[PDB]
Amino acid sequence: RMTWNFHQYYTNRNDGLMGKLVLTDEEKNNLKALRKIIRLRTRDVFEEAKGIAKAVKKSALTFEIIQEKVSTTQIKHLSDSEQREVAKLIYEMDDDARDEFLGLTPRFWTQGSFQYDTLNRPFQPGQEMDIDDGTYMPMPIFESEPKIGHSLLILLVDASLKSLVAENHGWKFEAKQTCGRIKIEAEKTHIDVPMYAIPKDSENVNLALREGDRKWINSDPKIVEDWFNDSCIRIGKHLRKVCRFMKAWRDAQWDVGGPSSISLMAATVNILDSVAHDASDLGETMKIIAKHLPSEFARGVESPDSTDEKPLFPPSYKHGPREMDIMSKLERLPEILSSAESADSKSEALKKINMAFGNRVTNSELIVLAKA
Ligand SMILES: Nc1ncnc2c1ncn2[C@@H]1O[C@H](COP(=O)(O)OP(=O)(O)OP(=O)(O)O)C[C@H]1O
Ligand SMILES: Nc1ncnc2c1ncn2[C@@H]1O[C@H](COP(=O)(O)OP(=O)(O)OP(=O)(O)O)C[C@H]1O
Ligand SMILES: [Mg+2]
Numbered sequence: 001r002m003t004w005n006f007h008q009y010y011t012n013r014n015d016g017l018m019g020k021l022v023l024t025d026e027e028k029n030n031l032k033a034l035r036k037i038i039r040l041r042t043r044d045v046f047e048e049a050k051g052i053a054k055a056v057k058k059s060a061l062t063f064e065i066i067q068e069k070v071s072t073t074q075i076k077h078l079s080d081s082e083q084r085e086v087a088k089l090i091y092e093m094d095d096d097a098r099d100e101f102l103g104l105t106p107r108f109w110t111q112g113s114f115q116y117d118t119l120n121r122p123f124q125p126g127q128e129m130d131i132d133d134g135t136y137m138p139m140p141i142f143e144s145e146p147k148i149g150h151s152l153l154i155l156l157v158d159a160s161l162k163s164l165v166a167e168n169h170g171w172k173f174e175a176k177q178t179c180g181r182i183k184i185e186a187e188k189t190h191i192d193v194p195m196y197a198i199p200k201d202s203e204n205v206n207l208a209l210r211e212g213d214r215k216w217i218n219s220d221p222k223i224v225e226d227w228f229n230d231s232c233i234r235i236g237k238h239l240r241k242v243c244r245f246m247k248a249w250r251d252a253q254w255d256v257g258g259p260s261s262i263s264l265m266a267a268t269v270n271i272l273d274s275v276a277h278d279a280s281d282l283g284e285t286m287k288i289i290a291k292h293l294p295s296e297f298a299r300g301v302e303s304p305d306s307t308d309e310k311p312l313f314p315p316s317y318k319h320g321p322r323e324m325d326i327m328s329k330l331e332r333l334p335e336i337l338s339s340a341e342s343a344d345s346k347s348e349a350l351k352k353i354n355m356a357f358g359n360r361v362t363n364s365e366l367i368v369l370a371k372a
Contacts, residue, residue: 129188154210203218219308
C-alpha cells in the first residue's frame with residue numbers, strides 16, 4: 001500500500017507551493033503603497049470638485065467659468081466631452097444636490113484576496129496579481145437614483161485613476177463593468193476600484209455598474225468577506241491554503257479564463273463543510289476536494305450572498321464551450337492527483353502533480369514515500 005505523500009509539496013513555505021504562491025513582504029508592501037496612492041488621489045479629486053461646487057454655492061458662476069475651474073484640476077485628464085459633462089453636472093445641481101455633494105467624503109475598503117489573504121503570485125506571462133480597493137460614497141438612502149449622481153461619481157473616480165495613469169510611465173487605465181482599473185504591466189500588477197453608494201451613517205450597499213440597464217446593484221462585499229472569514233474559523237487554517245492551491249491550478253490550466261476565484265472558494269467551502277478530510281495530509285485533502293468539485297460545478301455554484309440569484313458558475317444546462325472546458329479540466333484533476341500518488345518514482349510524482357499546478361515546485365524531496 002505504498003503511496004507518495006505531498007503534504008510538504010503543498011505546504012512548505014521555503015520552496016513548496018505555499019512558498020511559491022505567497023507574496024513576499026516587499027510585494028505586499030508595494031501593493032499597499034499602490035493602494036495608498038490611489039486613495040490619496042481619489043480623496044484629492046473629490047476635494048477639488050467640491051471646491052468648485054463651493055464656489056457655485058457662493059455665486060451662480062457661468063458655465064464658462066465653471067469649465068475653466070474644472071480644467072485646472074485633475075479632471076483635466078478626462079476627455080474634452082467628459083470635462084464638459086462634469087462642468088455641466090456641477091452647473092446643473094440645485095441647492096440640495098450641491099449641499100449633499102459638499103458633504104461627501106469618499107471612504108475606502110479593500111476586498112478580495114488581498115483582504116482575506118489568498119492572493120497568489122501570478123504564474124504565466126500576462127497573468128497579473130491584483131488588489132481590489134473599493135471606494136465608498138456615503139449619501140442618503142435612495143431607491144433608484146442618488147442625490148449626487150451616478151454619472152458624476154464615476155467621472156470623478158475615472159478622473160482620479162486617469163490622472164495617475166497620465167503621471168506614471170507604464171501605467172494604463174482600463175474601464176470594466178464593475179470597476180476602473182490601473183494596470184502596471186512591468187510590475188505584473190493591477191489595482192481595481194469598484195465604487196459603492198452606502199448610507200450616510202447590507203441592503204443599502206450599492207455597487208455602481210458602468211454600462212447598461214441598471215446603474216446600481218445591491219452587492220455588499222462584506223457579506224463575502226464575513227462568510228469567508230467565518231468559514232476559515234469553522235473549517236480551519238487549511239481552508240486558505242486549499243483555496244490558494246485551487247487558484248494556482250486555475251492559473252496553470254488557463255492562460256486567460258477558467259472559473260472565478262470566488263466560485264472556487266464557494267465550492268471548496270461547501271465540500272470541506274460536508275466531507276470528512278484530514279488537515280495533517282493536505283495531499284489527501286486536495287484529492288478529496290478534486291473528487292467533489294465536478295459535482296459542485298455541474299449543479300451551478302451558488303453565491304454565499306443569498307440575495308444574489310445569479311450563480312457564480314452556471315449549471316450544466318447553460319454551458320457553452322468555456323464552461324464545458326472548465327468541466328473537462330475539473331474532471332481531469334482528481335485523475336492527475338491519483339496518478340501522481342502512485343507514480344513509479346519521486347521525479348515522476350513531481351512531473352505528474354506539476355501537470356495540475358504548473359512547474360513551480362522543483363524540489364522533489366518535498367515528496368516522501370508513505371503508506372495509505
Ligand atoms: N460574482 C460575484 N459576486 C459577488 N461578489 C463578487 C463576484 N465576483 C467578485 N466579487 C467580489 O469582489 C472581490 C474580488 O474578486 P476577484 O478579484 O475575482 O477575487 P479574489 O478573491 O480577489 O481573487 P484573485 O486572487 O484576484 O483571483 C471578491 C468579492 O467580494
Ligand atoms: N457583485 C459583483 N459582481 C461582479 N464583480 C464584482 C462584484 N463585486 C465586486 N466585483 C469586482 O469585480 C472584479 C472582478 O470582476 P471581473 O469583471 O470578472 O474581472 P476579471 O476576473 O478580470 O474578468 P474580466 O476582466 O471581466 O474578463 C473584482 C471585484 O472588485
Ligand atoms: Mg482580486
